[PDB]
């Protein structure tokens, strides 16, 4: 669900030449959440 939302966000700015400040801030928080989910998935399978 997070990945699909990020993909939709990219298409919204795909036509636009430059991503404005509000879009960058929303991208940053989405990436921060995505980092935690990836870290959580990594911790599940390591050991292995």
């Amino acid at each position: 669900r997070l990945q699909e939302s990020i993909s939709d966000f990219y298409w919204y700015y795909s036509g636009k030449d430059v991503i404005e400040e509000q879009g960058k801030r929303n991208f940053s928080k989405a990436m921060s959440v995505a980092k935690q989910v990836f870290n959580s998935l990594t911790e599940y399978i390591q050991g292995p």
């Binding site: 669900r1 699909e4 993909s7 939709d8 298409w11 919204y12 795909s14 036509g15």
Partner: protein
């Protein structure tokens, strides 16, 4: 193994109806040349009367999300629920579309479903939605699943109308379950497959199987 529908695959849009307590399966068909409007070809009686499947085949050319479709309109993928698909008629090379006309008298809010010469505009794009709670948006569309097709331009379902004495397909606000039964996914080079048009040569490319020419005494039989 579970089969998943992908782009460039030929499929048939198939629905079901009740006729005198009998379950009749119908395929969406269109001639293309000379008649843009789509009709329904019955297929449940294929044992006794073969259906005309040459005009029922559609190719899944593209499958995009709503945002991707909006971006491309302003300017082999696996099918996912919620994506917008582009169906091209195999014979006429036209595209399934929600026409702006309406030849039906029972439903005043319905639109005719037919073929469009070009893929331009949003009238030839349909969004796939799950028919039941079993599937959710974003999941892969599997062979044999019941689908709900909604026109992007008109926000109307691909509807089977039984209001009149006949069975007709139109774009209405009442939903109808459809099955995208695959015909062929990938064909190897050469390697004859079903549904192809070919010639049957006898010897060394000299004689071929054929019938008599036009206006012949044997009635071309």
């Amino acid at each position: 193994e579970v089969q998943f529908l992908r782009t460039d695959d030929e499929v048939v849009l198939q629905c079901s109806a009740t006729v005198l307590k009998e379950q009749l399966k119908l395929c969406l068909a269109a001639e293309g040349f000379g008649n843009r409007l789509c009709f329904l070809e019955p297929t449940s009686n294929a044992q006794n009367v073969p259906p005309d499947l040459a005009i029922c085949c559609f190719t899944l050319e593209q499958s995009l999300s709503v945002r991707a479709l909006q971006e491309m309109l302003a300017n082999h993928r696996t099918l996912l629920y919620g994506h917008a698909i582009l169906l091209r008629h195999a014979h006429s090379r036209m595209y399934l579309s929600c026409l702006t006309t309406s030849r039906s008298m029972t439903d005043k809010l319905a639109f005719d479903v037919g073929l469009q010469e070009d893929a331009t505009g949003e009238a030839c794009w349909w969004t796939m939605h799950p028919a039941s709670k079993q599937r959710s948006e974003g999941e892969k569309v599997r062979v044999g699943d019941d689908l709900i097709l909604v026109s992007v331009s008109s926000e109307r379902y691909l509807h089977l109308s039984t209001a009149s004495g006949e069975l007709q397909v139109d774009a209405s606000f009442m939903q109808t379950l459809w099955n995208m039964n695959p015909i062929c996914s990938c064909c190897e080079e050469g390697y004859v497959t079903g549904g192809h048009v070919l010639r049957l040569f006898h010897g060394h490319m000299d004689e071929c199987l054929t019938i008599s020419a036009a206006d012949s005494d044997d009635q071309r039989r």
